[model samples]
Target: MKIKNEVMLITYPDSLGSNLKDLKYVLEAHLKEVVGGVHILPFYPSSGDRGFAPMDYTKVDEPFGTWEDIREISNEFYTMYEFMINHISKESVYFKDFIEKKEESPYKDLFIRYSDYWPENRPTERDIDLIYKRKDKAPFIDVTFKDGSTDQVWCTFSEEQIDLDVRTEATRKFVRETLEFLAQQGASIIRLDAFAYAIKKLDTNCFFVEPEIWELLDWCRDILEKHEIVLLPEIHEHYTIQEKIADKGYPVYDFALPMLVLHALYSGRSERLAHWLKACPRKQFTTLDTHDGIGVVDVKDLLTEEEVEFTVNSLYEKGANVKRVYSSEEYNNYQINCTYYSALGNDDQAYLLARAIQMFAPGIPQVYYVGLFAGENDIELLEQTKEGRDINRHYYSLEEIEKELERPVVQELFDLMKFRNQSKAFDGTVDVQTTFDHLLKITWTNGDSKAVLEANLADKTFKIYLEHHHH
Candidate 1:
């Protein structure tokens, strides 16, 4: 399946229901016309981080059904699957083998041995500080080999997720084979998750290492290009990085929109949001929310330093059940863990207006499953799991989805999605203009198919005018 210009739904395999089967049922029953693609978030068997620690790419987790289920869904709508490009599970066969055999292991080169990475007795305090890292301490884990030998190995994320040495031919082979395998499994687009962390250099930040990163991307591209599968590099840093990737002619994630939209709705001003929508990449996927929290770092220059502070302050004050502690020091991501609905105070009109603006934004829209039904922050889940991101990762049963669909806001959002998916105008050029300080007008023109969105940020109201076309 090829990537469609229609709206895409980002969901965990078990999010829609319990497994892939139930997810397909929900898609057919309720979202057939509302979405044209589905990004199943890391369904492979995993050790931790909600499937970020992939044990194997060849097989699906038994709990999430099988590849047959994934293929069935892809048979209908285009599918996007995640490829954790940066690291693999420490419990994986490759890692376990390397740990058990040490120097004797063929897969030893698969991981970055910190001893081999840095100069002996080096990587001093300053060197550690120079490297961009997720944890407060250096990004490495101590591993004791089978024979009473212990050494530090690169582990960018969690202990479960040990970083791969992409500089090695062994790692390149692993990436190539995995990508080709996934492309064969009906993945229209393979999202390279945490790709910026794939490259690690001596003196640099070790994040998004230039030239090397491009080489790694090209390697994946050459492998997947044969299958015509798109490579979407997932980076949550600055918006300029996204622009750089887009300039390379690859689709980038519009992570900046989430914060810019919040800024607009919070301040009741359209300058920042309008500026972004006008200049954002056309060949991108726009998102207001995702499985993770609302990103604050991605909107750096797009929102002034004070505006960012104001948005965060306003979010805690106005959002339902959102707290500062959730976005506190424990998590490294500069993000606030709150459902988009709750971020808007769970106001239906405001949420719908946000969705409308997202639709009118310059790119295909991706609505997270939780946002599909206007879900609020799951404090219960958050407390139960003790994970900040769990606040937005609500588990919805079939009955709950049915009940949610009854809401006027959800229904209207579905209608808007249907319009977005069906309108040919979205496949053409977009013109974003601001008439007043708080007023925004976005028009999409594609031959006879034209759709216009007029929105007022002050009152959180919007109207979508579609020009009827007969094909």
Candidate 2:
């Protein structure tokens, strides 16, 4: 399957219903024209981080149904799956074997033994201080081997997600086999989750280490090339990192748009968002929302310091049923926890306008499942789980789906989706022209076919301009 240039839905296996079968029902029954592709976030069995810590990529989690269920959906829409490029589940057979058999295990080289990575016995004080990490301490864990001795192994993100040794041939072989197998299964594009953190070296931040990062990416790209599949490196970083990847002609995600869109809606200015739309790579995936919460780090430099503070402050003040603590360390410090609907204070006008702006942006747009329904923050779910991100991870029943789809905002969004996918004008090129601070016009042309979105930033009102069949 080839990647489609239409909007893709980002959903979990259980998000739309109990499993993939229900998801398929929702896709075929409701979203046939609204979405052209699906980015199924990590459906594999795992130990933690949703589905990121994969015990194995060979089979679908039984609760999610089977590969046949996944293939059925792929038959209609291009599909994407994840490859946790940086780490694997600590409970996985490979890691367990290494723990039990030590050096004798065939999978021993799959993990980066801290003993070998440090050149010395372990990362020295300076080494620990210099390394880029997720926590205040070094990214390592002491493992108790079967022989009764303990050795350190590199661990990043969570204790269950043990980092992989991408430099070794054994691990490279594993990568090749797993990716090719997934390509054969039905994946149109394999997203490399946490790719920038895959490469590590001495004295470097270990986050997107130069030269080596490119080298590792090339290695993975080569393996995927053999299977004729596309690779999307999933990382949340500055726009420049994305631009660099785009220069190599690989696809990247427009992660910065989520924050900038909020800024535009809140401040009624188009300069920053307009500049990004004009400059971001066309060979990219644009997103206003995804499985994760709206990212705060991606827009660091794009918005002024004062502007960022104002947006954050306005988020709590104007947004509906939202509080600073939802995204703060008290509940969960990971990301902003409100849904796009609530983030705009459940203002149908602003929410609709935000969707219009995202649709007009360059590249294929992605809508998280919750956003597709104009979903409000899942306060009940958040309270039940005490996890802040769950506020945006809403599970919809078939009956509930019918009711939500009845909302005028959702109905209009469906119409917008049809426009985004079916229009030829949105095909090849996009021209963004902001006539003034409060008004921006984005025009698209596919030869004679044309479509335009002329929007008022301050009032949050927009209308579509479509070509009347010239050719």
Candidate 3:
């Protein structure tokens, strides 16, 4: 299969409102105008205030336009974008019904029930703690109902976002059916979000390796493949396992390179990154940032001044000496002028360099919506709480910034996309090789197309020699 050069436009759930018809138009217009031919994966309510309440498996929440509007947009953008499925809000109607009726509910057999095994009122568990933990419990956490009797109810993620137990046959049917429904509605790609925590184990952190979860994924993959649907899993921070999944004949999201980008910025040495890719054995999806967490531009400081500058310079410079190239538009679109970049000396020079490296890196690079358009971090948009403020809420909307910034990053990304589309280098397998003397190289090749990505970790530049192909 040919790799389609793509970028991801992730919108926050809160951003979708009754006026979403207009919002979709605005979003579609901007995305089309900016990063032409890309993928838009808007966040479906999973948890928090933005979570969808009274969830219906067949419909999108009313707040983000009506179900009809969503269907229309889905149809309109089907050829151009993808949609995410899997997991629903804890406060959704299905979960509420499951909680209220238990085994009597039509969906009772659809979810996992551990009520008989796990006690609801463990004296050690507090009410507030119970509320949060209940979200993860099967069947349901025991709660004092309005009728005064204690009842077991299902919840997951939070009191708002519910977990769907794929371990159950009925739940499997629902998911499979939902997949088909989405396919009929024009969903070309179905992203399986938060599959890592889908199934729990007694002694381990529930994630990718759970036999049941992988089985479900493979099952889903087979179904989607029959309909020619693409399956993209959101496997965060675990590149090794991601590779394992990719090796299983599915496309996995590349998180290692993004983390490496963070490390390169912080440590000033791309050696670690080079070493990681060299050592890893699978090809997966990669991006600078996404809606779920901070983007590379947002957290580049994880690197030092010298190293950061090197990365920034390498990314921004226009000459041939640089491995990656950027247009004047992208250089301007990155808009690295926020407080974050303000602290760095010579912001213009620094940002250009950083942008170049990110765009130029070899991999299936995915660009976040806000990051590409030089969107500033929205500190005020986050809701504050006693435990901590929401770090994921700092989103940038087109309404908030200068429209000019939008075109550059979009154009630059398109340029990179075009290169990626034509370059066989990205499809080649990667191997990491490093020297103790402070030089790192990540080489990729398919047949005769070979490239050695070299980075020097030392503060002072030193000549590094390579004897082709035989690292």
Candidate 4:
């Protein structure tokens, strides 16, 4: 497979179901004319029961056009886009069957079930309103089985997302079969969503517990490898930064780099940022800027225009202040604040710069749908009720923005995608070095050609010197 630097378009549920058909021409035209070749992951099997609620695995629900429409869209893109296929909606037919039938159902063994489950411990029974009155609530729920028997169910995540009983042989077969089905559908990459929370045992919470996840991934990899499908696991927790997760053990997404990059860029500490980039592990997965987190544009305010100028000048002057500025305690304080800026709103320039740095910085950079076109901020969509707010349910939407502004951001993103696709700087096996003057200096080399990537950390532009040996 030829590896090309790419961007991801994560479609909203509405867009996938209805809006996409209406705007197909416009959207397709924009993608082709501006973005060159990109990847699209439509939102389906959503956690929330919405339009085309996931009821059947084999059938495409209404309002989302049809499998035929998806086929057409994929054909239009020459099968360059990808779709999600990890967990299905709670309302999905398979899930509903698992819920309704319990152990008696043919698919009963397909999900996680405790020896004795109950409301307090049962994470999938969302309809129950009962709460444990005592301070020490039992984690397991006791329920009456259809055969006049009672058992316990473990609720690790929530009442909505039931844990899959992967311990069962039947369950593993079902999951593996699902992977095979998606591969048949021309899925170039199978994104393992919420993969960290996939396996939960009585003694372990199962977050990066190694053998458990690695074993599962190895299974999925074996299956996909046969079909030539790529596995991209969405490991959301902080432990994903560990080397074992990166190094091609299983292609995991780079979430930490974006956070660090945003901090480095906004703090005007490019040299320190460049140093950090040297340690990054190269892999064949998308870069982070997903729907769940804050966008890059919101993080730009960490550095004022004066700060940007100073950092740029410092880089040009060969100044030593780069290390001091990026490492100072005061600088650390600003880094924390910069993180807050990520949540404020969508800003295109910041998003663009972040994407550029990721693409040029010697790794596979992935772009989320919202971040790509500067999607509207869904701050109002966040639930406010105490109990409701406790549940993290913030999802990105394209319809939230005025159509006028949406068009241009989309265009800008497409342009950036085109640049990434055509750039040789994104290719394999490159050397990276950090310039210590608080400026991020990226020196990329392939054979005899070399390029210097420099970003000012202080409020000045410093001259970036480059030397290469040519025989």
Candidate number achieving the greatest TM-score relative to the actual structure: 2
The lDDT of each candidate is 0.91, 0.88, 0.48, 0.49
TM-score for candidate 2, please give it: 0.98
- Summed over model 2, clashes come to 0
Alpha-carbon error at 261 in model 4, in Å?
A: 2.6
lDDT of 3 by residue, 1-471 (tens): 112443344444344232447546654655543332234344344345343332554655555555465555555443222322335655556666766776566776654444542455642344334331323343244555334556444455445544566667777788888778767755666777666666644433344445766776788889888878778776554355656677777777654454455445444565556655545434445555554432233223334456545545543342221112111222221212122222122233333334434433544455554455434334344223211112223444446433533465445544444444455554666566667645556555666676444555444232212233433
Minimal lDDT window, size 10, model 2: 115-124
Candidate number achieving the greatest lDDT relative to the actual structure: 1
By TM-score: ranked, best first: 2, 1, 4, 3
Which scores greater on lDDT, model 1 or model 2? 1
Clash totals for all candidate models: 0, 0, 23, 51
Residue 184 local lDDT, model 2:
80
For candidate 2, the per-residue lDDT at 410 reads 93
Of candidate 1, the 10-residue stretch with the lowest lDDT total is 326-335
Please identify which of the two predictions, 1 or 3, would achieve the higher TM-score against the true structure. Answer: 1
lDDT of 2 by residue, 1-471 (tens): 677789999999999989999999999999998999999988888999889999999889899998889989988999999999899999999999999999899999999877677775556788888877788778888999998978888887889999999989999899999998888878889999999888888888888888888888887788777767788888888889999889887899998888898999999998988888887788889888787778878888898988888888888899888987888777766268888889889999999899998898888899999999988888899999888889999888988998888888899999999999999899857888987798889999888788999888898888899885753
Q: What is the lDDT of residue 380 in candidate 3?
A: 42
